[PDB]
Symmetry: D2
Subunit: 121 residues, 4 copies
């Protein structure tokens, strides 16, 4: 699924996920969030299962963005964990965790959780 994953994806918020899948299981690219304390592109890296099951299952993958670039620093990082599902309506179905750096006193509220669905259109 190197060819299936590589490209430009869009989620339900209108964020843009630009990724290259390497033969070795690497994910590289950029993320642009339509929401939150974010502007322009941020570096992402991650991993995917480069030899998935042949039993109709999706392809497990994940990636990280740290919300620092040349424009802004939100002192936070999001990880998306999900699976790629190929076919006419290809999708990447994810759940995510967004952790902010906090004081010890605020650590109980450090982490947001949500779900993003990415499509090729």
């Amino acid at each position: 699924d190197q060819a299936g994953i590589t490209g430009t994806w869009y989620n339900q918020l209108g964020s843009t996920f630009i990724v290259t899948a390497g033969a070795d299981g690497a994910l590289t690219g950029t993320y642009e969030s339509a929401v939150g304390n974010a502007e322009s592109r941020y570096v992402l890296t991650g991993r995917y299962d480069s030899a998935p099951a042949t039993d109709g299952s999706g392809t497990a993958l994940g990636w990280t963005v740290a919300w620092k670039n040349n424009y802004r620093n939100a002192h936070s990082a999001t990880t998306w964990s999900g699976q790629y599902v190929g076919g006419a309506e290809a999708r990447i179905n994810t759940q995510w965790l967004l952790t902010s750096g906090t004081t010890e006193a605020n650590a109980w509220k450090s982490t947001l959780v949500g779900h993003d669905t990415f499509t090729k259109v």
Copy 2:
């Protein structure tokens, strides 16, 4: 916190997290899980906030492992989202999402969630 993060970390399960923090915000290294469908080291990559707040807050970071190596393939990926807290008892406090590749019929049960605390000892 490049120097603070770089090194060998251990979680409460006895897993080993070996990481290098790059000046650019990169995380690279290997993960060895003490539990689950796993043996030996797996590649990891991720990101951290390379210019954190100076107000006593932790340093946001995340990383991904796809559970494929030369020995086993669990057709799954874990992402850890958390923060590094420096000092005498340095810690990386994380929450994680483990997604398996599934059929559509099993996708409701694709994702485990948990929490790992990493220490230098």
Copy 3:
């Protein structure tokens, strides 16, 4: 939103959520899962914000099912945490945590996480 919440709801899996919202903030009713180790109705209870904000925000709520009834016992419990959004296309948007009873050795994999959207049709 007592009247708005009270009734029969259906999620994307075809599960049936039957609830009564009490003037005091109580949620009572039954849940029938279309998937998993489940048959027929299970008791649920929960709580909702009985005096929500008047600024266009949704209404926070949550509920629990323990997966024991007269037919089956899956030794697990799900909690749904979410918000009710009123209007022509009323919705309850949730994230959920499903914890199984485990040995200590399996506790790292005790908890599934997912997201359900409930509608009135």
Copy 4:
């Protein structure tokens, strides 16, 4: 585990969880949070597995608090999903989801996730 669960529990934040386990699987009581937009006691309800496995596994349970009482209204609800582990050092090990009522534009950041461990001391 009706007798094992019923009583006063305390988490790592110094919150107080007062619960009664019913023969029928009900959980009733009050919660007092040491942190956040909270004062005094709030109603809770939930469910637990009243016929757990006899193979050394914990007892699955969950409960909800809506953060409205006679003093404050945070327009939010937390659900805890976890398991009770009996013995000399009895524990309730939970993960939780805290959903706030939001506008549609803020719904992506509606839900915090965390983990609480409750003990009898």
